[PDB]
Design a binder for this molecule. Structure first.
Ligand SMILES: Cc1ccc2c(c1)sc(-c1ccc(N(C)C)cc1)[n+]2C
Ligand SMILES: Cc1ccc2c(c1)sc(-c1ccc(N(C)C)cc1)[n+]2C
Ligand SMILES: [Hg+2]
Length: 97
């Protein structure tokens, strides 16, 4: 049996500018088994208009890229939440502007 913790990067396509359109990305990789939950949150609310890659597998583990087009503002908070068996509790990774 193999258990591997998701590695998570949360990043915008470009440096943020309030009122300027951009992409927000949550890349989750290196995990096993494939059981996982991934959501993007804006101000504590699941983001509805999201795209992602088809769940896939690399001998060196599982990976998903999950993203959305967005326009940030001064006060909006974004995060990617990941749950996986290797985590003691679901992990919230904030977008650091
Ligand atoms: C599958 C896989 C493995 C590693 C991996 C990714 C995907 S995506 C990533 C990444 C690296 C640098 C940055 N910025 C400088 C914004 C954003 C994301 N890494 C390091
Ligand atoms: C985790 C979490 C939960 C709730 C939550 C946030 C983060 S951030 C937020 C907020 C409230 C007001 C504004 N403006 C007036 C621009 C922008 C963001 N709420 C309401
Ligand atoms: Hg899905």
């Amino acid at each position: 049996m193999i258990q591997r913790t998701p590695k998570i990067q949360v990043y915008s396509r470009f440096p943020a500018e309030n009122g300027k359109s951009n992409f927000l990305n949550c890349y989750v990789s290196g995990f096993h088994p494939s059981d996982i939950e991934v959501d993007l949150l804006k101000n504590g609310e699941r983001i509805e208009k999201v795209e992602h890659s088809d769940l896939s597998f690399s001998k060196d583990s599982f990976y998903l890229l999950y993203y959305t087009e967005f326009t940030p503002t001064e006060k909006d908070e974004y995060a990617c939440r990941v749950n996986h068996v290797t985590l003691s509790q679901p992990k919230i990774v904030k977008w650091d502007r």
